[PDB]
Amino acid sequence: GGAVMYPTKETAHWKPPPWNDVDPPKDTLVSNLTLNFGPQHPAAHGVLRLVM
Amino acid sequence: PPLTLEAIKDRVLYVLKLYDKIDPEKLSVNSHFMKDLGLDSLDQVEIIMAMEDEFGFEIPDIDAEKLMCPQEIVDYIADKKDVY
C-alpha cells in the first residue's frame, strides 16, 4: 500500500498519491499590483491618492 | 533526527543566551525570567517570539504567559513536538 515498494528512509515519509486529484496549493500565489493613482496624476484632480 | 529533549533544552538555552537583557551567568533552566532574570512582560513576549522562531511552531498568547521558566519552555516545546 505504499507509494513505492522496497521504500527507503526518505521515501517512507513521502505520502502515496491522491486517489482522485492533488490538493490545490493556493497560498498567496497571486499578489495584486498596488498603484498610487494620485496625487500628481493628471486624472486624480491633484489631491487624490487612490490606492488601487 | 530524533528531536531529543536535551537538544531542545540546548536550543532554548542558546536562544536565551543570545538575548542581551538576560545575563549569561545567572541563566538557568530553573531560573524564572521575571524574578530570577528580572526581565519584564514584554521581555518575556520577545523571548517567546525568539523561541517560536527557533522551533518554527507558533506559541499562542495563553500558552506563552504560562511560561517564564526555561524548563517550562522546553516542556511545552516537547508537548507540541510530541517528545517522549
Partner: protein, 112 residues
C-alpha cells in the same frame, strides 16, 4: 461602563501583548521597505518606548482604544500609507535636545 473590547485589565493586557508582537515582527520589514537607515534594534527600542509611554494606564477602555490606535498605525506602516517622513517622525532627529534641569530652563527662557 460598557467595555470597548475587554471587560477586564488582563484581557486588555493580552491584546497589548498581541499588538507588541505584531510591531516587533514588522520592524525589520519596515526598515527594509522604507529604506530607513536605523537598525532593527533601534526601531524595536522605539516600539518599546512608545509602548512604555502609556504603561501607566489603569483603565481597560483606555487601553483598548490605545490598542486600536496602535493597530491603525501598524496597518499604515504595513502598507506604505505612511512615508519615510511619517515613520522617522517617531525619532525626533531634527528637534534639538531640551534640558530638563532647573538651571538650564532658567538660563534658556521664561518657560516653566
Amino acid at each position: 461602563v460598557k467595555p470597548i473590547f475587554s471587560r477586564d485589565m488582563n484581557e486588555a493586557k493580552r491584546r497589548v501583548r498581541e499588538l507588541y508582537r505584531a510591531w516587533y515582527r514588522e520592524v525589520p520589514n519596515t526598515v527594509h521597505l522604507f529604506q530607513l537607515d536605523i537598525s532593527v534594534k533601534q526601531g524595536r527600542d522605539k516600539v518599546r518606548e512608545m509602548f512604555m509611554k502609556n504603561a501607566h494606564v489603569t483603565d481597560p477602555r483606555v487601553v483598548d482604544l490605545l490598542v486600536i490606535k496602535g493597530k491603525m498605525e501598524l496597518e499604515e506602516t504595513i502598507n506604505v500609507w505612511k512615508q519615510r517622513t511619517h515613520i522617522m517622525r517617531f525619532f525626533h532627529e531634527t528637534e534639538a535636545p531640551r534640558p530638563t534641569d532647573f538651571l538650564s530652563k532658567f538660563y534658556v527662557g521664561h518657560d516653566p
